Amino acid sequence: TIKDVAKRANVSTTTVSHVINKTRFVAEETRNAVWAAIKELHYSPSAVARSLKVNHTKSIGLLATSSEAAYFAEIIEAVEKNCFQKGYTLILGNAWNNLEKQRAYLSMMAQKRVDGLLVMCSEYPEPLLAMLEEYRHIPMVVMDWGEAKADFTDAVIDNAFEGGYMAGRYLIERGHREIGVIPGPLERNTGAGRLAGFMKAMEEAMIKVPESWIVQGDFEPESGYRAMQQILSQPHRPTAVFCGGDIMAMGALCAADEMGLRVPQDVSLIGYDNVRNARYFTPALTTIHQPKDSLGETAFNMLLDRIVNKREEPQSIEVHPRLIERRSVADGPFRDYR
Amino acid sequence: TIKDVAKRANVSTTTVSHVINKTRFVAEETRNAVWAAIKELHYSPSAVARSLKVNHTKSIGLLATSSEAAYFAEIIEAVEKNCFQKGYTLILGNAWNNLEKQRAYLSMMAQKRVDGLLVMCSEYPEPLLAMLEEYRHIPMVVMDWGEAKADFTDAVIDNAFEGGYMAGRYLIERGHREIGVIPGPLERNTGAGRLAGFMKAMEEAMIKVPESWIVQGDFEPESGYRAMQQILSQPHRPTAVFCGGDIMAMGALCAADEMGLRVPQDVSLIGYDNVRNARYFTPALTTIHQPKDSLGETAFNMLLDRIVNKREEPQSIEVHPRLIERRSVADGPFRDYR
DNA sequence: TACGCAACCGGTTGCGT
DNA sequence: TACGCAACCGGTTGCGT
Ligand code: HPA
Ligand code: HPA
């Protein structure tokens, strides 16, 4: 069809091309005509054709886990913003922590020849670890590890441990010593990592956590509900609870409110993430905030660099968590004796 | 590089091709060799090359509004599931109710030659209306109108009005007559349409809504907060409130809980959407459920048809809302006198 | 000066033998 | 029998004049 343009315009296609991409001088008269031709013709230049030659699709691929979850959703929205802002196009792909689906997506992505890859697969078993290496060639950044797990990629690191520690302390310095914890999957960073940041704080203060007091979540509200309830269901119950993430948290508030417990009056809750609506949680949630947006843009940019500046050596940027004080935590028994 | 394969395998590329796409018989010996060549070679066949010839990218484009919002997010997750399941690849693009960004996305999409388009732009002014026609050629379904607004597209319709009516009735039949309403943007379907479904129910019951009692929302929690609060801030206040959507609702619960009002004891709230976590709202939200998942898959399929079965005539499928009874509504003053 | 020739990017496919 | 020739899909670009 570029041919149809050149022809209506009575010029070559090389010409037609150059005008469309402002790539070498062209007479006005000339320029005009092509524009008109492109116009009456209702012309849209194919990018697949163009891509075939130039050797880049100008589109990036997000090999995500799931996309509804507030946490995820929020990052993604970020990343898209950035792609759009720099001409990139986004391919959102969710493997749902499934290898098979992951190999698949990875393969379609390669075939569609994505300029780069953004990886958020939550859990990284050896198998997934290996597959990814099989594509070192396509440039990529893993956005969700605690520390760099491989040399063939870029990594953006969150400091989940120092976030976990932050959560513990606050609890501590506010009067508590009988604390519970609902962590997320241990097979994750935001799971294991947040937990241990928290646990160090406890060891530091000679506070021990009764195992009947730590209940595994999966980052979903329901798991929050079930844990909160299994915790407050006990003879002896804590005065404060540290919840792995905001959504599961919001599920801990429900349960407590269902056994007519009071937050923060009967139980204080500290969450983790600082999702867009935690302030409108009830009560408004106190939690550790993860810079999700800088998490996103910071990832793009590392990619873009590898893409453009053709970098070869892996990089790793750290991002920082921070405390957001709301109204779901209350002083505890030991406040004044400090 | 297909050439490099053919060569290592000592056969033609036509051959190499046919084996890779099981498109005509090939000797085993032959088949094997190519597989081996593809292998040692670590071969990934380009789809852009392939697309160039076959004339289809095998990828669809979502011209969305925003993607963090639970409602949206949930649909999207749906749609992706379906694309993946039928080989399609997804391009998520959010125009944020901005024409300029919309023209842009639309254009990149055309250029990248998407097999079809899924449209969710919330508001459709004449301008946006026109641009879309400029692409009748690319096959598309609008997933968010109340009734079909143009002949050059497919439409999936939700029945927002009969959802709005449902919400009113329940309120009514539960004892209420002093009701308020926080609608979403009137420039939308889920805004205007839900409102009027609701208002008919009221007219039907000689119930009038004091204008100081209807407060505009924007589907965001904060707008929920501000409205709830502007409503209960009055001398004379309603006994029940109908909220345009679940997230704004969850923001209405916060405020009420902040002026120490009681839900549903001091105010009953009926929401709209049935988002994944409304059950874990506090109290667990009573609301009208929109089949979001069937909303998604039902859209794909209309597209896929137009794509595959090359249909030309616009279609329109209707989907149905339904009541989900939770614990945020309580009997009202007139219950027994009915 | 301002522009055109023609080869190539990596696959697919209609005819052949 | 099982397979190869070569033209084409729609652009881009190094040399020319
Ligand atoms: O691994 C995770 N999954 C879901 N939500 C999360 N929020 C923090 N970490 C996670
Ligand atoms: O237009 C809308 N926008 C956001 N959320 C929504 N939920 C229902 N309708 C809408």
- Pocket of ligand 2, beta carbon within 6 A: B 69, 71, 122, 184, 188, 190, 219, 245, 273
CATH number, domain of B203, equals 3.40.50.2300
Q: Detail the residues of B annotated as belonging to a binding site for hypoxanthine.
A: 71, 188, 190, 219, 273
Q: Are both B83 and B221 inside the same structural domain?
A: no
What is the C-alpha separation between A337 and A257, in angstroms, rounded? 30
What is the C-alpha separation between A19 and A38, in angstroms, rounded? 11
The C1' atom of D2 and the CA atom of B9 lie apart, in whole Å, by: 15
Question: CB-based burial of residue B29 (10 Å sphere; 0-12 exposed, 13-18 middle, 19+ buried)?
Answer: exposed
User: Containing H/E element for A40?
Assistant: helix A28-40
Q: Are both A194 and A330 inside the same structural domain?
A: yes
- Let me know the angle formed at the C-alpha of B71 by B66 and B77, rounded to the nearest 5 degrees: 80
Three-state DSSP at B37 gives helix
CATH number, domain of B21, equals 1.10.260.40
What is the C-alpha separation between A246 and A207, in angstroms, rounded? 24
The C1' atom of D16 and the CA atom of A170 lie apart, in whole Å, by: 75
Q: Which residues of A touch B110 (CB under 8 A)?
A: 44
**Domain boundary pick from A57, A75, A90:** A57
Given ligand 1 and candidates A68, A75, A145, A190, which is best to mutate, with the most ligand atoms within 8 Å of its CB? A190
Q: Extract the runs of DSSP E, i.e. beta strands, from B171-267.
A: 179-182, 240-243
Residue closest to C10 C1′ by Cα: B49
- Contact status, residue B295 vs residue B253, Cβ threshold 8 Å: no
Given ligand 1 and candidates A188, A216, A243, A250, which is best to mutate, with the most ligand atoms within 8 Å of its CB? A188
CB proximity A40 to B under 8 Å: no
Residues B171, B172, B177, B181, CA torsion sign: positive
Whether residue A280 and residue B224 make contact (CB cut-off 8 A), yes or no, is yes
| Residues shown for chain A | 338
Q: Which residues of B touch A54 (CB under 8 A)?
A: none
Q: Which of B245, B254, B249, B331 is nearest to B289 (CA)?
A: B245
Asked if A7 CB < 7 A from strand D, the reply is no
What is the C-alpha separation between A166 and B179, in angstroms, rounded? 45
- Contact status, residue A196 vs residue A188, Cβ threshold 8 Å: no
- Contact status, residue B225 vs residue A280, Cβ threshold 8 Å: yes
Extract the tokens encoding A143. Answer: 């956005």
Q: Are both A301 and A152 inside the same structural domain?
A: yes
| Torsion angles phi and psi, residue B232, rounded to 5 | -80, -5
Q: Are both B214 and B332 inside the same structural domain?
A: yes
Extract the tokens encoding A29. Answer: 């008269």
- Contact status, residue B180 vs residue B335, Cβ threshold 8 Å: no
Q: Is the peptide bond before A321 cis (omega within 30 degrees of 0)?
A: no
Question: CB-based burial of residue A336 (10 Å sphere; 0-12 exposed, 13-18 middle, 19+ buried)?
Answer: exposed
| DSSP code at position A214 | B
User: Containing H/E element for B32?
Assistant: helix B28-40
| Torsion angles phi and psi, residue A141, rounded to 5 | -120, 130
Q: Are both A1 and A14 inside the same structural domain?
A: yes
Q: Are both A205 and A270 inside the same structural domain?
A: yes
Q: Which of B214, B220, B57, B196 is nearest to A113 (CA)?
A: B57
Cα distances from A286 to residues A263, A325, B237, B244, B314, in angstroms, run: 11, 5, 31, 27, 50
Phi-psi region of A72 (alpha: psi -120 to 50; beta: other; left: phi over 0): alpha
Q: What is the resolution of this structure in A?
A: 2.9
**Domain boundary pick from B38, B57, B76:** B57
For A113, nearest residue in chain B (alpha carbons): B46
Given ligand 1 and candidates A97, A119, A161, A273, which is best to mutate, with the most ligand atoms within 8 Å of its CB? A273
For A:86-115, CB contacts with B below 8 A are 87, 89-94, 101, 104-105, 107-108, 110-113
Q: Which residues of A touch B112 (CB under 8 A)?
A: 47-48, 59, 89
Q: Are both B295 and B234 inside the same structural domain?
A: no
Q: Are both A28 and A68 inside the same structural domain?
A: no
Tokens 């400091």 map to which residue? A159
CB atoms within 10 A of CB A301: 16
Domain count, chain A: 3
Helices B126-133 + B99-111 axis angle, to 10:
10
Owning domain of residue A10: 1-57
Asked if A54 CB < 7 A from strand C, the reply is no
Quote the distance between the C-alpha of residue A28 and its chain's center.
48
Q: Are both A188 and A276 inside the same structural domain?
A: yes
Outline where A67-121 has alpha helix (H).
70-85, 99-111
The DSSP annotation for A218-277 comes to: -SSHHHHHHHHHHHHTSSS--SEEEESSHHHHHHHHHHHHHTT--TTTT-EEEEEE--TT
CB proximity B68 to A under 8 Å: yes
- Contact status, residue A331 vs residue A264, Cβ threshold 8 Å: no
Amino acid identity of residue A320, one-letter, is H
Task: Give the number of whichever ligand sits closest to the CA of residue A121.
Answer: 1
**Domain boundary pick from B25, B57, B89:** B57
Cα torsion for A278, A281, A285, A291, to the nearest 10°? 0
Give strand D nucleotides closer than 7 A to any protein Cβ: 2-6, 8-14
| Torsion angles phi and psi, residue A335, rounded to 5 | -45, -55
- Contact status, residue B118 vs residue B63, Cβ threshold 8 Å: yes
Residues in CB range of A186: below 8 A, 6 or more apart: A192, A195, A216
Residues in CB range of A115: below 8 A, 6 or more apart: A56, A57, A58, A59, A60, A88, A139, A307
What is the C-alpha separation between A94 and A138, in angstroms, rounded? 18
Residue nearest to atom 7 of ligand 1 (CA): A71
Measured in Å, residue B71 CA sits from the centre of ligand 2 at: 6
What is the widest separation between alpha-carbon atoms in chain A?
A: 90
Q: Are both B294 and B284 inside the same structural domain?
A: no
Q: Are both A338 and A202 inside the same structural domain?
A: yes
CB proximity B319 to A under 8 Å: no
- Contact status, residue A253 vs residue A280, Cβ threshold 8 Å: no
CB proximity B247 to A under 8 Å: yes
Amino acid identity of residue B41, one-letter, is L
Q: Are both B269 and B231 inside the same structural domain?
A: yes
Our CA-based measurement puts residue A149 at a distance from the nearest CA of chain B, in whole angstroms, of 24
- Contact status, residue A161 vs residue A146, Cβ threshold 8 Å: yes
Q: Which of A196, A167, A141, A189 is nearest to A307 (CA)?
A: A141
Phi-psi region of A96 (alpha: psi -120 to 50; beta: other; left: phi over 0): left
